[PDB]
Amino acid sequence: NSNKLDSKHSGNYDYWYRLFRKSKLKPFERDISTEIYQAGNKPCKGKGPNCYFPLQSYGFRPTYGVGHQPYRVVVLSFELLHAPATVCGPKKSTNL
Amino acid sequence: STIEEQAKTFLDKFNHEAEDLFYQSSLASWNYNTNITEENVQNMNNAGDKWSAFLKEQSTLAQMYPLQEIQNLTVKLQLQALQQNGSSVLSEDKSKRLNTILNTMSTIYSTGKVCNPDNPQECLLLEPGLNEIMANSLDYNERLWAWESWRSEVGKQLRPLYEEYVVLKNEMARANHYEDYGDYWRGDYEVNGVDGYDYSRGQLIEDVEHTFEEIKPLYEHLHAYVRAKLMNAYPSYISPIGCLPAHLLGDMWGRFWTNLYSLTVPFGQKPNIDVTDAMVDQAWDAQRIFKEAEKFFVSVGLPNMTQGFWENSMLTDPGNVQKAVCHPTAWDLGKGDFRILMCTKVTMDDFLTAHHEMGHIQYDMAYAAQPFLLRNGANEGFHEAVGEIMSLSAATPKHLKSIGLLSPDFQEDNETEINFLLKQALTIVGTLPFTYMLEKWRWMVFKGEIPKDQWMKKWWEMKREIVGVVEPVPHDETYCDPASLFHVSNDYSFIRYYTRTLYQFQFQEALCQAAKHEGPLHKCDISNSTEAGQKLFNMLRLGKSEPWTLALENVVGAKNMNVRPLLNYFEPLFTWLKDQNKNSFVGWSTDWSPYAD
Numbered sequence: 001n002s003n004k005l006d007s008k009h010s011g012n013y014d015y016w017y018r019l020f021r022k023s024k025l026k027p028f029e030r031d032i033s034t035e036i037y038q039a040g041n042k043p044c045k046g047k048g049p050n051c052y053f054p055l056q057s058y059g060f061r062p063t064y065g066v067g068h069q070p071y072r073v074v075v076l077s078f079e080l081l082h083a084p085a086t087v088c089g090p091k092k093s094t095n096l
Numbered sequence: 097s098t099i100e101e102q103a104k105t106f107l108d109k110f111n112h113e114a115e116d117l118f119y120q121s122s123l124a125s126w127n128y129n130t131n132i133t134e135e136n137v138q139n140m141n142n143a144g145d146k147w148s149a150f151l152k153e154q155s156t157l158a159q160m161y162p163l164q165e166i167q168n169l170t171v172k173l174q175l176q177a178l179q180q181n182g183s184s185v186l187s188e189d190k191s192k193r194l195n196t197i198l199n200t201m202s203t204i205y206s207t208g209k210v211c212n213p214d215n216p217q218e219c220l221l222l223e224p225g226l227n228e229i230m231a232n233s234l235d236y237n238e239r240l241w242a243w244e245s246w247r248s249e250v251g252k253q254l255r256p257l258y259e260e261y262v263v264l265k266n267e268m269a270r271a272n273h274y275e276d277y278g279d280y281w282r283g284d285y286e287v288n289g290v291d292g293y294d295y296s297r298g299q300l301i302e303d304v305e306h307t308f309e310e311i312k313p314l315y316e317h318l319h320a321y322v323r324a325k326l327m328n329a330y331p332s333y334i335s336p337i338g339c340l341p342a343h344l345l346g347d348m349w350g351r352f353w354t355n356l357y358s359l360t361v362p363f364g365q366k367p368n369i370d371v372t373d374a375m376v377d378q379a380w381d382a383q384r385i386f387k388e389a390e391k392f393f394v395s396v397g398l399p400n401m402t403q404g405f406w407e408n409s410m411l412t413d414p415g416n417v418q419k420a421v422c423h424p425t426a427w428d429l430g431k432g433d434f435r436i437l438m439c440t441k442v443t444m445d446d447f448l449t450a451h452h453e454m455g456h457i458q459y460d461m462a463y464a465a466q467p468f469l470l471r472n473g474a475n476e477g478f479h480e481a482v483g484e485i486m487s488l489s490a491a492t493p494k495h496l497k498s499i500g501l502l503s504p505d506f507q508e509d510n511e512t513e514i515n516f517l518l519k520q521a522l523t524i525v526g527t528l529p530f531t532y533m534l535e536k537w538r539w540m541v542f543k544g545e546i547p548k549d550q551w552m553k554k555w556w557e558m559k560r561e562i563v564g565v566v567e568p569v570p571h572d573e574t575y576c577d578p579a580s581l582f583h584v585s586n587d588y589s590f591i592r593y594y595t596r597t598l599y600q601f602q603f604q605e606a607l608c609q610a611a612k613h614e615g616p617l618h619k620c621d622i623s624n625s626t627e628a629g630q631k632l633f634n635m636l637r638l639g640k641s642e643p644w645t646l647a648l649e650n651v652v653g654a655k656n657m658n659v660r661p662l663l664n665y666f667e668p669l670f671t672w673l674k675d676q677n678k679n680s681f682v683g684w685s686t687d688w689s690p691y692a693d
């Protein structure tokens with residue numbers, strides 16, 4: 001939980017997330033989309049009545065519930081593929 | 097493609113914008129109400145103007161969605177709550193005239209002054225002055241003068257203005273497909289589209305009339321007892337069969353009979369429960385009071401409290417440099433920011449008031465995840481009732497003994513519980529007929545059933561027939577005495593109190609049954625039970641996205657208001673009081689009046 005650094009009064013309006021995309025994403029994909037969504041029929045241009053801007057804001061304040069609390073998440077991924085390993089754990093031993 | 101999805105997108109936008117706007121508005125109100133300056137007034141005026149403009153803009157923009165093409169209930173509730181334009185359906189001219197007449201109602205009621213007939217320059221306001229006059233003075237002449245001066249000063253000014261108020265409100269209600277303003281007010285309890293939970297607009301009138309019918313006998317017995325005590329105190333002013341005078345009921349309008357306690361105390365010699373000596377002896381302060389209530393709320397398993405409330409809320413009077421208006425109010429600023437404001441003193445009354453305020457905060461915090469348009473009680477009457485049930489629980493002497501405020505050597509007996517129940521009856525039983533008759537009378541006035549030239553006459557006829565209250569000096573149609581009340585003159589519904597009285601006792605009975613208590617309903621304690629807390633939470637999380645009937649059933653299992661808890665709680669009181677009333681006349685005569693000799 002990050003409640004001291006990634007929190008501020010008067011609301012935190014800096015963090016984003018996306019709720020609209022044409023289809024499902026593929027694993028480990030980056031998509032900085034700027035196009036406007038379309039519902040099913042209109043040749044709409046711009047922010048139409050059925051065409052919206054697909055970016056929202058993570059409104060944050062330090063008086064939030066635990067379930068809604070802005071948790072800091074980092075994921076670590078490894079690959080067990082046969083190749084020369086460059087990073088490995090340390091080990092140390094006794095005296096001579 | 098469909099209009100439902102466009103409605104979902106519109107509500108999604110409105111929720112996130114209105115959260116910030118309402119937060120700024122409520123923060124301005126919070127910095128004004130506690131800290132009274134002139135620039136904070138300007139800041140609140142600006143914030144409120146922005147909030148009202150936003151509400152009007154959203155209503156105008158979302159009026160183009162017809163409600164006939166919505167399926168899932170959640171959205172339909174949001175759109176119905178949003179679409180109510182209120183006064184905006186009326187033309188601009190009559191709307192502004194209405195807002196001015198409302199402002200004059202507020203100014204006249206707040207600044208109303210009455211002067212004694214011996215000193216023109218010495219005049220008294222109501223809350224600072226007449227309140228104390230009719231709450232402490234035992235002099236008949238002084239109470240009569242306070243009643244008559246206040247009424248003759250406010251009602252004559254407020255009568256034609258109330259008439260045009262009723263006309264404009266009826267016109268606006270007819271514009272909004274309502275037969276009368278009474279129907280507009282009754283629409284709060286309205287629900288549709290849910291099978292097995294429907295509720296009609298006349299159903300409210302029917303059930304309230306039935307409940308008053310079943311509650312009548314205890315009120316009449318208490319009236320007989322109070323009348324006997326009053327003739328014991330005042331032999332030459334009250335008839336053995338006639339109705340009680342209005343200005344002998346403890347307050348300005350007969351709303352509460354809490355003052356008359358000393359008159360109807362059964363054992364003036366039996367000690368009364370009070371732990372202010374316990375707080376001063378143990379050096380209790382506001383922080384310890386609120387921590388004690390914190391642990392009381394934790395005892396049932398409710399969610400334990402947050403940091404910002406303790407850090408930023410003022411739990412004490414802010415000295416004399418800054419002056420605060422500290423009526424007990426729980427503030428939900430939105431976005432998880434909950435706050436409290438009241439000038440805390442070391443008194444048991446403040447202990448119960450704090451428990452009530454924390455109960456409101458607990459309710460407010462329970463539905464924090466609910467969207468912006470629905471973050472409110474299932475109806476209007478669930479907030480206060482939930483706040484008052486906690487104070488009722490904390491007032492039990494068992495809890496006081498448990499938390500080390502009352503000595504374990506204290507001997508509970510029949511007389512002490514009879515005294516406590518008489519106190520509770522004087523605060524509760526006295527106000528039910530007043531609330532019922534007041535709201536009902538306004539309903540007929542709104543319905544327009546009573547012609548203009550007999551409003552006061554019919555009002556007093558109802559009072560003498562059903563409430564047992566008769567005026568001491570006759571009044572003509574130029575008076576507007578009902579408007580001499582805070583709720584009547586400032587556009588508030590009054591039935592809320594009757595429904596709250598029923599709901600709080602229904603909840604108390606249900607939770608006490610769930611608590612497995614072996615003893616009198618009034619001795620019941622709800623701590624030690626996380627099952628009761630879970631039962632309370634099962635409705636606390638609901639809010640009002642679902643019909644109020646379902647929320648009530650989730651607690652008591654009943655889909656309608658019932659009077660069984662109220663009669664069961666006061667049953668020992670009822671049997672003792674009927675034991676007393678064997679030698680006194682039961683009922684009242686409407687013909688007798690103090691001014692008729």
Ligand SMILES: *[C@@H]1O[C@H](CO)[C@@H](O)[C@H](O)[C@H]1NC(C)=O
Nearest residue numbers: 126127130131136410414418
């Ligand atoms: C006094 O007024 C200021 C003005 O914003 C406010 O910030 C402060 O909280 C007030 N003091 C209180 C509420 O105790």
Ligand SMILES: *[C@@H]1O[C@H](CO)[C@@H](O)[C@H](O)[C@H]1NC(C)=O
Nearest residue numbers: 100166167168169170171172
């Ligand atoms: C309403 O929405 C809920 C939650 O998504 C869903 O479970 C339910 O089937 C919907 N009902 C209708 C009538 O669309």
Ligand SMILES: *[C@@H]1O[C@H](CO)[C@@H](O)[C@H](O)[C@H]1NC(C)=O
Nearest residue numbers: 394395396397398399400401
């Ligand atoms: C916090 O609340 C839970 C119930 O929600 C309760 O089990 C726990 O005892 C509370 N915390 C403390 C310190 O009592």
Ligand SMILES: *[C@@H]1O[C@H](CO)[C@@H](O)[C@H](O)[C@H]1NC(C)=O
Nearest residue numbers: 611612613614621623624625
């Ligand atoms: C008090 O605590 C324990 C809980 O197991 C038990 O003696 C008793 O059931 C509790 N009292 C009530 C009223 O639940």
Ligand SMILES: [Cl-]
Nearest residue numbers: 533537555558
């Ligand atoms: Cl009436």
